[PDB]
Amino acid sequence: MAPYNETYASDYAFAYEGMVSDIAPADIISRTVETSAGIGFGKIVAQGTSDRGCKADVSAVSPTAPPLGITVRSQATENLTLDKYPRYDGAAIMRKGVIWVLVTDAGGVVAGDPVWLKKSDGTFSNADVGSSGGLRLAGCRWDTSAANGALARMRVDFDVPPVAGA
Amino acid sequence: MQANFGFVTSQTAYVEAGVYRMRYPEIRYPGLIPVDYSAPEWIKTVDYYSMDGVGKAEWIADRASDIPVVGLAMEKATTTVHLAGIGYDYGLEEVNQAIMLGMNLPGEKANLARLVYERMVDRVAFTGDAEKDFKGLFNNGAVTAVSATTGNWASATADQILADFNLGITGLWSATNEMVYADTVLLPSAKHQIIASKRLGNEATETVLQFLQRANVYTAETGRPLTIRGMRGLNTAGAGGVSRSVFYRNSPEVLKMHIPMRHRFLPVQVVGLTYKVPGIFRLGGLDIRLPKEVRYVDGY
Amino acid sequence: VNQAIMLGMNLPGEKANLARLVYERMVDRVAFTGDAEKDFKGLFNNGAVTAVSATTGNWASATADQILADFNLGITGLWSATNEMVYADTVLLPSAKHQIIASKRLGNEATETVLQFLQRANVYTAETGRPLTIRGMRGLNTAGAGGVSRSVFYRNSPEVLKMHIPMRHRFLPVQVVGLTYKVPGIFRLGGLDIRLPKEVRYVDGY
């Protein structure tokens, strides 16, 4: 009977942090979490050192060492970390479907835009940062107009090599 | 006065039939607070759940495959329970001197112990004790209290009375983003008298309480009736020692009191010509869950 | 799903109910507003109907004379806009304004009857004997020209408004792909259609 965090919303929300939207194709890949803390749901991941592991640290990704994919919302995750994949757990990375993610940009994004990754934190945006600290995920595009700090769905394809931007 | 337990009657005297017991105020917490007793007798906490779903609808085409999906989430919350008790005792020759006068001393003590138990439950329900932090209905600190529109209701005309009364219902309605209506109103008894004894005009001879029944916002928008009650402890419960009135919905889903154990007497004990009967009772406090459906108005 | 039976939750069965709920939500949103993707103009924002302002009426600090004049302005305007041929049957008002009307007395010290005396003395109920229906809605708070409240007067007949819904929400069998059960569900409807635009009238500024 818990009425806390009641906002009396006009209508239903759109999605959650890492939920997918149904479509026939999806590469979902099982990896093992390597970071000491968990990994959030809609997040980018790099290639681990365990030959099948992944890390949440993408500060050193390059066109030669591209990022691995994006985690998905699992909803059965050990109930000790709130919404995360705990250490030593199947990660369920996705690299082909359409997924809801979080926007980090001042002016927001619109339907068809490039997707730029900020290597410092691992956040998605519309344009390059400008100090050799951003990559462009070459095969990727948005699918929703959204403001700053809101959820937008994007279409992703990680087999296309990334592009470095200074 | 005199606890000597016996009296002397005179040859030349007249005696009235029956004894007069001192009066105490009525009990006033049935029907105004939802309580339950289904909790097991020895519990420490109570839990309850909530959940919210999410989704969107999109335009599909033939031979396509992309259809939008829905989602879920959940939450949990808890409350506590505590223990208290009262019981009586008596000596040997006291009860024996009692029985030969046809009195039944043990019964007279059990009756009054039930009475004082009910009194304790009332005080916990409607107020707080500041020992177990059992916030009551009249002083809960998580609901919103607003001041009246300059209304003292003495030397105030009927327009101000009606505006002040409807202010609370409208404010509660706007606070919940226009979804729920206040269902019950609790006023200090003095203000209830002021309303019930003031007329509506020289040509409209009728009380402000007889017209307000069928013309308040709640009974005008919908067809259901509104219930107005005058209470006893609201004379000075406000912010600066001023009258307070409460508007709320009165559903088991907004307020809740748990009483796992009502009141029990334990087997008698004997020590040195005495008889001790311990009575214990264990009940948790009042829980206001939906705090946006209870409204305080001060200054009437 | 094999894990949410351990707690007795019935996950697949909880989703179909909420899908039907969001279904009805979508139908409502299409019926009463517009999406600007298929150009389905709604009832509250159709651009072919005439929208006039109120006669200097705010309905807060406004006496009963202004309230009555403003309310009957819509009916008389609908009568004058179709060359004196048709009558408004139904009125939709913002809910706060409905409160203001239902609570405020008739400006009387004599009997203090409510303004819903309008129920028996409006133009429509006066010329004829038929009653008038007044409702309070939800999305009319800022639907006006400059972000102000809007109210609607119309006739409520199947020859003025029409919405076709040939097929209702159904569910299709379950597709299984690599430890994931994908389940579709479809429906089909047609946008709202205002055939007589002179039989719908907008009054802003109440």
Place this chain on the structure above:
Amino acid sequence: MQANFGFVTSQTAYVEAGVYRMRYPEIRYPGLIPVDYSAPEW
């Protein structure tokens, strides 16, 4: 609001049977807009 299908309970605790579903406004289209279902499905 979390998404884990799990909460840690205790032995000395009484979990209530019901669940509170978050409220949303009513539907309000039936009775104001004439709709028909007579046309063929496709």
Place this chain on the structure above:
Amino acid sequence: KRLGNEATETVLQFLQRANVYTAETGRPLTIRGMRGLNTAGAGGVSRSVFYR
């Protein structure tokens, strides 16, 4: 339109039983609303017609 500022049990169409014609005699008066009278006046103003 209403009748009083404040005591208003009836509409202005009490005119039906308090006009000069229905006051001096007992016969009723017939009032009609027409269509072509919106601008028939001298300078394009409304015109009303009284006749027998």
Place this chain on the structure above:
Amino acid sequence: VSATTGNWASATADQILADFNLGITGLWSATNEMVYADTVLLPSAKHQIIAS
């Protein structure tokens, strides 16, 4: 207790009603809100003033 500034000559009806209900409310509140007054004994002259 004394009345609330009421003489009942050159006093309007509001003062009369307030003074009359003052006794009933005061008696009720003195018994801790448990019993009301059943009978009122007024001097005959004041009863005339009220009844006229």
